[PDB]
Coordinates of C-alpha atoms in Angstrom, one line a residue:
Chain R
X1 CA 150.2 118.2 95.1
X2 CA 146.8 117.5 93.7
X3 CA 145.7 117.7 97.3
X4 CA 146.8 121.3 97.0
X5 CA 145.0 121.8 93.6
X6 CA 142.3 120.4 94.7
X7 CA 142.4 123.1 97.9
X8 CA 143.1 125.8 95.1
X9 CA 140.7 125.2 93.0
X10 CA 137.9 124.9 95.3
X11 CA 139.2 128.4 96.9
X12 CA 139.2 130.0 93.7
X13 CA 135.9 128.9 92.9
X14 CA 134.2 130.1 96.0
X15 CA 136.2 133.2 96.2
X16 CA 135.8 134.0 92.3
X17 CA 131.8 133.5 92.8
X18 CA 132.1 135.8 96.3
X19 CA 134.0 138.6 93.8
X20 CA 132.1 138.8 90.6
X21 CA 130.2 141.7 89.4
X22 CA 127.0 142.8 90.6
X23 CA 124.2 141.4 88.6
X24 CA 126.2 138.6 86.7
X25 CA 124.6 135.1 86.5
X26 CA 126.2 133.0 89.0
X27 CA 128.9 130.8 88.2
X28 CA 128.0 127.2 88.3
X29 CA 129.7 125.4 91.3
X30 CA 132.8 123.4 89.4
X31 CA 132.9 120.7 91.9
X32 CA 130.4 118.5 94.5
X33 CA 132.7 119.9 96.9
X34 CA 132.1 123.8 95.8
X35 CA 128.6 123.2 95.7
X36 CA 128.5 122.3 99.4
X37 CA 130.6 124.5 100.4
X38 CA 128.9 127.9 99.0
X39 CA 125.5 125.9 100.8
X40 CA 126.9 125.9 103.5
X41 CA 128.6 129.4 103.8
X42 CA 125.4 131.3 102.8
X43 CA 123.7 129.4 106.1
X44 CA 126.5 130.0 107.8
X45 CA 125.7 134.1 107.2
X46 CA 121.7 133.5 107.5
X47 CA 122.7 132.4 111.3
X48 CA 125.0 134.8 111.7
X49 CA 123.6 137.6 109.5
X50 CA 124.6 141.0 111.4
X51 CA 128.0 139.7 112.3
X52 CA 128.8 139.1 108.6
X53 CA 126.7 142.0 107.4
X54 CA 129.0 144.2 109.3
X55 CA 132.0 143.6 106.9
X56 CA 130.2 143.4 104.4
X57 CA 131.1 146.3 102.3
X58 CA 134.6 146.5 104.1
X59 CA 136.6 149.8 103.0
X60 CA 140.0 148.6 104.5
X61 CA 143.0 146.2 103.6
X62 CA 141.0 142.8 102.5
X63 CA 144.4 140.7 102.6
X64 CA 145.6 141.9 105.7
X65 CA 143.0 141.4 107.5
X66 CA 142.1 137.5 106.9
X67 CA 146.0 137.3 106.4
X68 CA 145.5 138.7 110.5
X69 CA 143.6 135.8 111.6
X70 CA 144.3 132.8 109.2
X71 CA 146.5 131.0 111.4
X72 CA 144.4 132.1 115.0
X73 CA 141.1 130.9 113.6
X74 CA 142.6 127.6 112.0
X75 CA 144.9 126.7 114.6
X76 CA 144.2 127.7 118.2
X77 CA 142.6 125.0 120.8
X78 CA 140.4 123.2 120.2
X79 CA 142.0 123.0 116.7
X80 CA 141.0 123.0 113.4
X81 CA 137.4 122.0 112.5
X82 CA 135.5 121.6 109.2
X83 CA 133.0 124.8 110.8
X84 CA 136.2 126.5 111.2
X85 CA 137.5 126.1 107.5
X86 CA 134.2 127.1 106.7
X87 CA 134.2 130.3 108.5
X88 CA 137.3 131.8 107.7
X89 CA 136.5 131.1 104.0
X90 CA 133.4 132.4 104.3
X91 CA 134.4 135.6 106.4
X92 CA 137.2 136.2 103.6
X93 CA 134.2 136.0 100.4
X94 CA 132.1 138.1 102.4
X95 CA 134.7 141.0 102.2
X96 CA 135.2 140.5 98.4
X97 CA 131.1 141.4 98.0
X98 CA 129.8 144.3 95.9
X99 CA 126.8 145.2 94.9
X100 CA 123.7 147.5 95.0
X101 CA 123.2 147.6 98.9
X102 CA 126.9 147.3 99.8
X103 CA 127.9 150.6 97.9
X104 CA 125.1 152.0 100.0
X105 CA 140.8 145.0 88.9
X106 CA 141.4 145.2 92.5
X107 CA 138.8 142.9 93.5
X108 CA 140.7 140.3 91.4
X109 CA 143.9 140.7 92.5
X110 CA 142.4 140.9 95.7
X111 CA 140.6 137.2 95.5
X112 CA 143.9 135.8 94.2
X113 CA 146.1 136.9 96.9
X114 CA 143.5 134.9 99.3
X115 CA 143.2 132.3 97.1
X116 CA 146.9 131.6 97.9
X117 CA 146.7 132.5 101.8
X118 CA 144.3 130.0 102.9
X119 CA 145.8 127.3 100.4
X120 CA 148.7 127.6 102.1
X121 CA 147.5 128.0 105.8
X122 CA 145.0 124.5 105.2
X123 CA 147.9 123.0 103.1
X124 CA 150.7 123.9 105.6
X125 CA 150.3 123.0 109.1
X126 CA 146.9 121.3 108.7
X127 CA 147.6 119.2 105.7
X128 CA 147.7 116.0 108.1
X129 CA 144.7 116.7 109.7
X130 CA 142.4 117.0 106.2
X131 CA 144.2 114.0 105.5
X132 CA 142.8 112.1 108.0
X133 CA 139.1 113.8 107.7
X134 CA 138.9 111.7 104.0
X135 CA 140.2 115.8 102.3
X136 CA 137.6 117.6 100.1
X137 CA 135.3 114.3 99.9
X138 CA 135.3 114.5 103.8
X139 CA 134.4 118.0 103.9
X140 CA 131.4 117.3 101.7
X141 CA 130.2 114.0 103.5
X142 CA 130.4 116.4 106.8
X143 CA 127.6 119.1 105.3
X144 CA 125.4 116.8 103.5
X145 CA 124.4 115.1 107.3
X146 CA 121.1 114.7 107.5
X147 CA 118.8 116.2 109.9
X148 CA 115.6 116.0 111.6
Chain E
X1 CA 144.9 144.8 117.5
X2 CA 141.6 144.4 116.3
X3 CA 142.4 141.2 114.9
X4 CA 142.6 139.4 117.4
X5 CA 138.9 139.8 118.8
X6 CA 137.5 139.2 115.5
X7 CA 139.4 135.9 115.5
X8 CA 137.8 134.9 118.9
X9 CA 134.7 135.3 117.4
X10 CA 135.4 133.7 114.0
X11 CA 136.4 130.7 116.4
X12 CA 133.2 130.8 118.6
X13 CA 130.8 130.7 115.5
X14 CA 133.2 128.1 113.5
X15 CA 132.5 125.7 116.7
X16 CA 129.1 126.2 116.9
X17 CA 128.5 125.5 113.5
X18 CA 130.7 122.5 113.4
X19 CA 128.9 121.4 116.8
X20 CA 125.6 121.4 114.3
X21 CA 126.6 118.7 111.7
X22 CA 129.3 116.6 113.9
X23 CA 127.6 113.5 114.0
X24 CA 124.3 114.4 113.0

């Protein structure tokens, strides 16, 4: 489905930027959609910096843990959301993060396993519903409101 | 089963955060 590429890529691209080497120049976003979406899960973390700064360097089992919560966070009442899509991603590239302050192969494998996990989970039981929010353009138009 | 509290709050900030652009 290019609905399901177009979930995959996005996934990979945000993930892929949340797992890369400590110090490497930053990956240019490879789509409007991935621009908006790393926006808005680095002020998604600014509001909520010590709750994601707590898993930030996160010792245990990356997969199992978002793997865990996937279909909780997506699915239970009120229902899915654009904020929620956007915080489960964003909780999943915040345990992929390394670097100077955190230490204070794997990773790869690691970002491709949840590249497939939440491509499924959005493609799955909530394909309908991204359907109907306009998909990836949607999510974009959602993020770049305007404010006061 | 820790997971399931850190899914509560994975749901509370995902609502509040939507509840920031929906609509405006």
């Amino acid at each position: 489905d290019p609905l399901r590429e177009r979930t995959e890529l996005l996934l990979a691209d945000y993930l892929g930027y949340s797992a890369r080497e400590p110090g490497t120049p930053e990956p240019a976003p490879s789509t409007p959609e991935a621009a908006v979406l790393r926006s808005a899960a680095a002020r998604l973390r600014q509001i909520h910096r010590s709750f994601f700064s707590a898993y930030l360097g996160y010792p245990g089992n990356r997969f199992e843990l978002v793997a865990l919560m996937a279909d909780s966070v997506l699915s239970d009442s009120p229902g899915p959301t654009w904020g929620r899509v956007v915080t489960l991603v964003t909780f999943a590239g915040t345990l992929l993060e390394r670097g100077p302050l955190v230490t204070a192969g794997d990773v790869a494998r690691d970002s491709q396993r949840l590249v497939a996990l939440l491509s499924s989970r959005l493609m799955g039981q909530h394909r309908a519903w991204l359907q109907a929010q306009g998909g990836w353009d949607g999510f974009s138009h959602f993020f770049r409101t305007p404010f006061p | 089963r820790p997971e399931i509290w850190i899914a509560q709050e994975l749901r509370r900030i995902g609502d509040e955060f939507n509840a920031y652009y929906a609509r405006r």
